[PDB]
From a paper:
Thyrotropin-releasing hormone (TRH) is a tripeptide (l-pyroglutamyl–l-histidinyl–l-prolinamide) that is widely distributed in the brain and spinal cord, playing dual roles as both an endocrine hormone and a neuropeptide. TRH activates the class A G protein-coupled receptor (GPCR) thyrotropin-releasing hormone receptor (TRHR), leading to the coupling of Gαq/G11 and the subsequent production of inositol-1,4,5-triphosphate and the release of intracellular Ca2+ ions. The cryo-EM structures of the TRHR–Gq complex bound with TRH and TAL were determined at resolutions of 3.19 Å and 3.26 Å, respectively. The overall structures of the TRH–TRHR–Gq and TAL–TRHR–Gq complexes have high similarity, with a root mean square deviation (RMSD) value of 0.66 Å for the main chain Cα atoms.
TRH is mainly synthesized in the hypothalamus and stimulates the release of thyroid-stimulating hormone (TSH, also known as thyrotropin) and prolactin from the anterior lobe of the hypophysis. In the agonist-binding pocket of the TRH–TRHR–Gq complex, Q1053.32 and Y1063.33 of TM3, Y1925.39 of TM5, Y2826.51 and N2896.58 of TM6, and R3067.39 of TM7 form a strong hydrogen bond interaction network to stabilize the binding of TRH. Ca2+ mobilization assays showed that replacing each of these amino acids with alanine led to remarkably decreased TRH activation compared with wild-type TRHR, verifying the critical roles of these amino acids in TRH binding to TRHR, which is consistent with previous biochemistry studies. Comparisons of the structures demonstrated stronger hydrogen bond interactions between the Y1925.39, N2896.58 with TRH versus attenuated interactions with the diazinane-cyclohexane of TAL. Cumulatively, stronger interactions of TRH with the residues in the agonist-binding pocket might explain the higher potency of TRH in activating TRHR, versus TAL. The ECL2 of TRHR is composed of two β-sheets and is stabilized by the disulfide bond formed between C179 of ECL2 and C983.25of TM3. Both R185ECL2 and Y181ECL2 were observed to interact with TRH or TAL through hydrogen bonds. Relative to the inactive apo-TRHR, the displacement of the cytoplasmic end of TM6 in the TAL-bound and TRH-bound TRHR–Gq complexes is 8.4 Å and 8.0 Å, respectively, with respect to Q2636.32. Structural comparisons between the TRH–TRHR–Gq and TAL–TRHR–Gq complexes reveal similar interaction interfaces between TRHR and the Gαqβγ complex. The Gα5 helix of Gαq is inserted into the central cavity of the receptor and interacts with TM2, TM4, TM5 and TM8.
Residue numbers in the entry:
A (entry chain C): 11 to 340
B (entry chain F): 12 to 60
C (entry chain A): 24 to 221, 262 to 334
D (entry chain D): 2 to 16, 20 to 80, 85 to 118, 125 to 177, 182 to 192, 195 to 211, 214 to 224, 226 to 231
E (entry chain B): 6 to 51, 67 to 178, 181 to 216, 219 to 245
Amino acid sequence: AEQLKNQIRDARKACADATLSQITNNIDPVGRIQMRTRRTLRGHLAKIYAMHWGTDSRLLVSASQDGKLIIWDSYTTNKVHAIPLRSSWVMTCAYAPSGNYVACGGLDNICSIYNLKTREGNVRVSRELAGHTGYLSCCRFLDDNQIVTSSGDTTCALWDIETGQQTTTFTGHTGDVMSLSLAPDTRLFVSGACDASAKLWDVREGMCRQTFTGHESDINAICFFPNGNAFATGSDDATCRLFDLRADQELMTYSHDNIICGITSVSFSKSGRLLLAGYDDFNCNVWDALKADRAGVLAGHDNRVSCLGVTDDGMAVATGSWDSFLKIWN
Amino acid sequence: ARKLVEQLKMEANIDRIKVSKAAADLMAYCEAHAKEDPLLTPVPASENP
Amino acid sequence: YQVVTILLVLIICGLGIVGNIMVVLVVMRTKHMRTPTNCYLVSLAVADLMVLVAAGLPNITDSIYGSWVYGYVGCLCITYLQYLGINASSCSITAFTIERYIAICHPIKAQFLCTFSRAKKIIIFVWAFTSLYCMLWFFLLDLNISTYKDAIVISCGYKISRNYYSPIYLMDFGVFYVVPMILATVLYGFIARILFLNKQVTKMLAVVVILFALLWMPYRTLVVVNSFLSSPFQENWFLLFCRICIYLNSAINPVIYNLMSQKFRAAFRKL
Amino acid sequence: VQLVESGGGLVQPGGLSCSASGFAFSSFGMHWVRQAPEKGLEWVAYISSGSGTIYYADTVKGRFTISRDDPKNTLFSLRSEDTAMYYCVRSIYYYGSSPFDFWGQGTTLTDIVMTQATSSVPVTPGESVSISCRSSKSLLHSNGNTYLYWFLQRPGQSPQLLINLASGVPDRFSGSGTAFTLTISRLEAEDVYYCMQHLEYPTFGAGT
Amino acid sequence: SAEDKAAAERSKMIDKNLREDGEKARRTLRLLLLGADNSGKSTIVKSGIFETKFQVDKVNFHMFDVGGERDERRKWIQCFNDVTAIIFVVDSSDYNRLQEALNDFKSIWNNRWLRTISVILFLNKQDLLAEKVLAGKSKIEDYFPEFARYTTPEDATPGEDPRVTRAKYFIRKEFVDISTASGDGRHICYPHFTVDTENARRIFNDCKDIILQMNLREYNL
């Protein structure tokens, strides 16, 4: 069946009989927002690879390459906790929706999980999760006992935290999976990879449900749309694609002429009408997620921007970057 | 490639939604929850930090 | 002697004024310019601007009117902006040389010491060490009025009359001319000792030990011999030459330290 | 996190330490709270994280002192009001914290005003044990968080915390600006209630 | 409020105990060891980021031998562009490997994040290519066809045999030719020839010239 894939993929292309940005081109766009730096969270020293927000929309963690996981206050610019790491080649970080747990993880093939609310006044390492053989690249949190890690041995996983070992492993990836996003609809997640595909996996079932190819080059940014029915992919060739889980084709790909370099992070506002993407041109960019125009540029950084996140209500947006400064807009 | 060739069609039974229906369905998350997003609109400055 | 020299300050102090504004609109405008070497070169850009406009204009109005136009409104304030514009555009040079010496002849040890939090510490240390020095130009400076046939000399004048006003210049000769030009000789020969041993930029580096010790040569000597010679030299033939050599000196400092580099040229070529 | 203080000896008022054990006091506040043999609670002192944000009682400003030996996680001129039993407070603040919670075993040697709301009620189980409270000013800041601190105690023992809803305490314990009520139901055994505020260094308004 | 005023001697007290920690992550120099197979890169100086540290003239170095799934090196290489030098070790051995292990040096040189950091070429086991050619059975002209067409220029190595030094300097010139083709002056290669104990100091006085060629561009000389 070497040629069997060319018949289903050509038939599924017929189910996608249009694009996105022609029906929403006539609607009222964003225009030009200048989400200026309300606060500016200074204190990291090396570059910054990942931040994750809080559930209360006022705390956030951030992961840096000096071996620090700093828990911030979005309101008073306050170092709530600064968690010293052991493996400082950190490429990802996460925050539990209970607000009790954070988890780091990077090139040392390991996901360490940290407990926030404790007695004896600390943030302790709860469950260090070995079991990967490649560089860990995106950890998330579905529950205080469910973490979905993506790694550099081409394997997505799923773990029982209290036990200490995996419950599932999600294979089917040629290149390394770089970035993962859990869904609001709690039974699915998605992960893009270096082989320009993005295998929609399944939390409850076990096997990777759908596939999503379409980039010219590798992929390093995944985020769910907040309805859980779509998601946007940020690649390393200045193409920021969006898809749909039950359509499997390209929803829209936000591209401009002046961007030639990689798109390190992708996030979404609470409306699902602000696609925020962090590029290698030493500055962010606000895309309107429907009409796909440059409707805002969050140029405040001097080096490449690697992370992004909108709150659980849409109020603020923090961006870290390699300038060691994480800058919350409003 | 033997187990992979039996896996390209073992999960290829996805019921497809049209993207034009989805381009009205993705806007259903935008025409609803519109004003509750502080960044799509010029939100006020009373309780906004 | 006075007809063409009115447009001679206005060509060399006006082009240095647009030269130093091209320095600070390259440092403060581009993203990756967060270097220590862009800090001493703004501590030299505006310090040369305090003589490219605060010393080029009081000699510009001196041509059209032989007396001081500003009177006491300016000749106590703008003369403070001619002993700080001189002594800080000649002491950032002392600051930038010891940066350029440690960066080359000890380049590992200057990957760690020299950072943006240390360059901002030394330029603020050196304006405050010299603003609190140049407050001495309030106590020994007052107006003066005299007259002659084709002269009514109300200029930005003086005080105790150059017999007791000497050590404002003899110490200034050994701090802002002797120090930044024998440390540009000892600590640029060491770059020549290393680059030519391991090198084609040593021509541009041999210029500025000559070019900065040649232009502060006659003026720091003139204000040292005017404190030494009773009824001193005050003619527009020679003493205007001791000011033209100053206004072009602070006009070519945007050319040396920011146009003779690969970094700031590509930074200029971005915008 | 088991805390403990030092007892102290009976000395005339005008003629202490909380050597707590086995936790991180270098990231916690370190209070003192006096409790009278006849009346009840009153605030005493403070030391924050970092050597020195020290407050003092208005009747003890210059009296016995407070400290924090943050390496060892330890701690090192009275009156009739200062002839009370001192009991310590563990607390630390961040945007989501539940401060004031753990109390030492302190029965030691011998102001924005707030209401009391019938300070003498005996034990009636089974039904709602709803106590109201009020303060002389609006506790609610512009952020939107009412900073009320409603405490508990035990007969012959150390205090604890009930109100939001702190930790280490049971579940059955449970408002507006300038006036707020609680809805506690289904009272059980091992039950000296309190309600305080901490918007400034003055202090609960009563002594129940 | 006094709660939030006590929630602000966190951020002024974390930085007292964090910026004093982040001033140790910039006093040591970073290297990146990168050798393919049977190259002896574990034996040049002496869980998946096996990293060693060594100090010479009181300058602590810190190289990161990264054991990955394959030699793609595409996406974990972005973490190492704050690094002074990529120490590249490759052996004096079979010539079907050295046409792929020199197509290794060409994907490290023409990279994107590595367009500023200058690679060190650290050729190991110098006394095992003579023993491959003193036996004479090594068909060096077979794999490398243009080897016999040229010969050695002056300044040869003092066991000063010309038939091996014609080959010793051939592979070095084969890699400098892929170095200086498209290098743009920002980064240059630094070849060597060693299993000897002259290995550590030859990275010390060579990363200096990687630094000194930045302070000839950073300090406007």
